[PDB]
Structure 1
Amino acid sequence: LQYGPLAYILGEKATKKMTEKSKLITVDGNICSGKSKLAKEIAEKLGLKHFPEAGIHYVDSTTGDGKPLPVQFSGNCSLEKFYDDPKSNDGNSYRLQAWLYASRLLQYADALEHLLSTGQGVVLERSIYSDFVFLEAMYRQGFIRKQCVDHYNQVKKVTICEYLPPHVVVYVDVPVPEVQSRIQKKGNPHEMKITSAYLQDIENAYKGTFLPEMSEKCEVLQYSAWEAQDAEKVVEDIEYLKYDKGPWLDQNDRKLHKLRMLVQDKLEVLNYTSIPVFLPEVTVGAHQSDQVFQEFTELPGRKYRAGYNEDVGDKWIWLK
């Protein structure tokens, strides 16, 4: 019984499956803050589902066979190109950013659909609430145009308003000199081209805008790099939270049913990420999009709705 009003009427109400362990946790930080490692330990210790940070190929991981697709089917967004040539005339910088916000929006919907359907909490690394720090850094460094920022805010305005914020926001605060040292040690040739000014912009946006905003409506825990090493103390901090803020206290079965109907319908989730605002960075001409869409339908198991693809082994198609 795929979830709907009928399933809701018959007793599939979110408050039944939810507990005081049903929480949405997001770990934030600058680049190379060990936030990935902290996020895994929190999930393991608290028995939550861990979501690796949503990258360029997150949506591929959730559809088809789950393996990544060729680049042209993500529009040719390259994080490596962003580092090598952040000011490329092709518009890769904002096109990557617009794609990544949509990837995070989809992931936030999956995480919320997991929380509401099973009751198990989730741990995310960054979210649609903190995606803007990279946009602010890009703009302040002159990588993207003012019009791109306006487009981003338009898309964020009509999308983020539908979703509840995280229960707990965890911030791992690492200074830019230490961030810059860990980057050079990580030995990724493109990442080492990152400059401290860009990194300082991310930090400023996090502390100037993100943390004050999330503090009003969420539980914010901030750890230095050293303190994040003590994951057990981090988990201990989380379990002693009062939770006396935000909209999660206003939710009831009727509102959570409306929320679940949204997050399960992924096209409804992504509706406004393609608003017809003709920004050159994200606009694709008819001939190209027609050609790429035709190639996409030729990929294995993509021509038809899932379960109706004989070319990947589906059977009983004439009774389905």
Structure 2
Amino acid sequence: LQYGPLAYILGEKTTKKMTENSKLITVDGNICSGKSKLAKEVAEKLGLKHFPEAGIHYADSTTGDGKPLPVRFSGNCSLEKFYDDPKSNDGNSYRLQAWLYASRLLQYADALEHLLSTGQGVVLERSIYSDFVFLEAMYRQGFIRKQCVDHYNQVKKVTVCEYLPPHVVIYVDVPVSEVQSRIQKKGNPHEMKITSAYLQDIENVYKGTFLPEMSEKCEVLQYSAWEAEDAEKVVEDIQYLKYDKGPWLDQDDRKLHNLRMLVQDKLEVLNYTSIPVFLPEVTIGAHQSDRVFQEFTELPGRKYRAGYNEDVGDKWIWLK
């Protein structure tokens, strides 16, 4: 392939490219915290690479042509049906949550891959260290079961221990009333069904569990709604941070080599998302899985490996 132990042996050390601009930044907040432009603005002043927030179709954007696959092939879930009926009987809530956790795990792997390969920091939106709060809101509002929380805890316990926290966590204080006002001004007819208690639970698992556990392994920058509208303010604060907490200090060439050999193998990243815990929300049975897999194979450019498809026009396959 491209990177391996031989590249580490013959000279490609990952701390020779590690500059002071190599900072992994995660911009967090509630459902309409206005962080969406803010992260891009934090990415455009610091010269960093912005990743959009992982929806259902992030893996569709990273592979193939980048166009979104149909929802039976990726996700088997809908954010809008979760906004309609969060207490559904098909278990769309936890299925949406587990697919979004796998998509954010893939996104965080992509962020670390760009960070360790190029030496350029990546600005993220709601990484895997902050995904769990939605689950807890979904657990407090009676949307899911405790077995779903146990499945999420086992997957998170075996997946997040292999990765690092970000350098900077940016959190945008927007209260529940202003989130509701921005939802009503947004115009999305499903998003206006989000209840007040669900937003308050998101804010409580933010301010009660996430921020007391990240403030020791990284640096928090908790902004309010009015001061986060100026990007120069946030970047102006980022460029004068005294980076002293977290496990980023004790990372040599070897530890980050092991991290990079973990990260670039995407199936090793996604190994433990599909653990054999037969939960009725996420377990797709045999005939449906076979039917959807054999429909996925017949998609254009998906039948073979990414350089071996004559239907989309790959040449010289008899010499590859």
RMSD between superposed Cα atoms in Å: 0.7
Q: Please tell me whether the aligned partners of residues 60 and 74 of structure 2 are also in contact (alpha carbons under 8 angstroms).
A: no
Q: Name the CA distance, whole Å, in 1 between partners of 2:296 and 2:111.
A: 27
Q: How big is each residue's C-alpha offset from its partner over 1:155-211, in whole Å with a ceiling of 9 and x where there is no partner?
A: 000000000000000000111111111111111100000011000000000000001
> Hey, what does 2:124 align to over in structure 1?
124
Q: Name the CA distance, whole Å, in 1 between partners of 2:184 and 2:162.
A: 40
Q: Please tell me whether the aligned partners of residues 33 and 174 of structure 2 are also in contact (alpha carbons under 8 angstroms).
A: yes
Q: Name the CA distance, whole Å, in 2 between partners of 1:22 and 1:290.
A: 44
Identity %: 95
Q: Name the CA distance, whole Å, in 1 between partners of 2:204 and 2:154.
A: 22
Q: Name the CA distance, whole Å, in 2 between partners of 1:310 and 1:16.
A: 41
Give the 4+ runs in structure 1 shifted more than 6 A.
none
Q: Name the CA distance, whole Å, in 1 between partners of 2:74 and 2:37.
A: 27
> Deviation at 1:318?
0.7
> Hey, what does 1:260 align to over in structure 2?
260
2:209 alignment partner, SS class: helix
Structure-2 change in CA distance of 1:75 and 1:24 (3 Å) = closer
Q: Name the CA distance, whole Å, in 2 between partners of 1:306 and 1:284.
A: 27
Moved more, 70-79 or 218-227: 70-79
> Given the two structures, how large is their TM-score scaled by the length of structure 1?
0.99
> Deviation at 1:98?
0.3
> Deviation at 1:152?
0.4
> Hey, what does 1:167 align to over in structure 2?
167
Q: Name the CA distance, whole Å, in 2 between partners of 1:309 and 1:230.
A: 47
Q: How big is each residue's C-alpha offset from its partner over 1:235-260, in whole Å with a ceiling of 9 and x where there is no partner?
A: 01000001001000000000010000
Q: How big is each residue's C-alpha offset from its partner over 1:55-93, in whole Å with a ceiling of 9 and x where there is no partner?
A: 000000000011100110024210000010111100001
Unaligned 5+ residue runs, structure 2?
none
Q: Name the CA distance, whole Å, in 1 between partners of 2:288 and 2:205.
A: 36
Any residues of structure 2 matched to 1:184-195 within 5 Å, and which?
184-195=184-195
Q: Name the CA distance, whole Å, in 2 between partners of 1:229 and 1:307.
A: 44
> Deviation at 1:45?
0.3
How many aligned residue pairs are there?
Answer: 320
Q: Name the CA distance, whole Å, in 2 between partners of 1:217 and 1:268.
A: 25
Higher share of residues assigned helix: 1
> Deviation at 1:37?
1.0
Any residues of structure 2 matched to 1:216-231 within 5 Å, and which?
216-231=216-231
Report whether the alignment pairs 1:32 with 2:35. no
Q: Name the CA distance, whole Å, in 1 between partners of 2:277 and 2:35.
A: 35
Unaligned 5+ residue runs, structure 1?
none
Q: Name the CA distance, whole Å, in 2 between partners of 1:253 and 1:76.
A: 40
> Deviation at 1:151?
0.5
Q: Name the CA distance, whole Å, in 2 between partners of 1:266 and 1:36.
A: 26
Q: Name the CA distance, whole Å, in 1 between partners of 2:95 and 2:215.
A: 30
> Deviation at 1:231?
1.2
Q: Name the CA distance, whole Å, in 1 between partners of 2:12 and 2:286.
A: 44
1:37 alignment partner, SS class: helix
Q: Name the CA distance, whole Å, in 2 between partners of 1:147 and 1:242.
A: 42
> Hey, what does 1:20 align to over in structure 2?
20
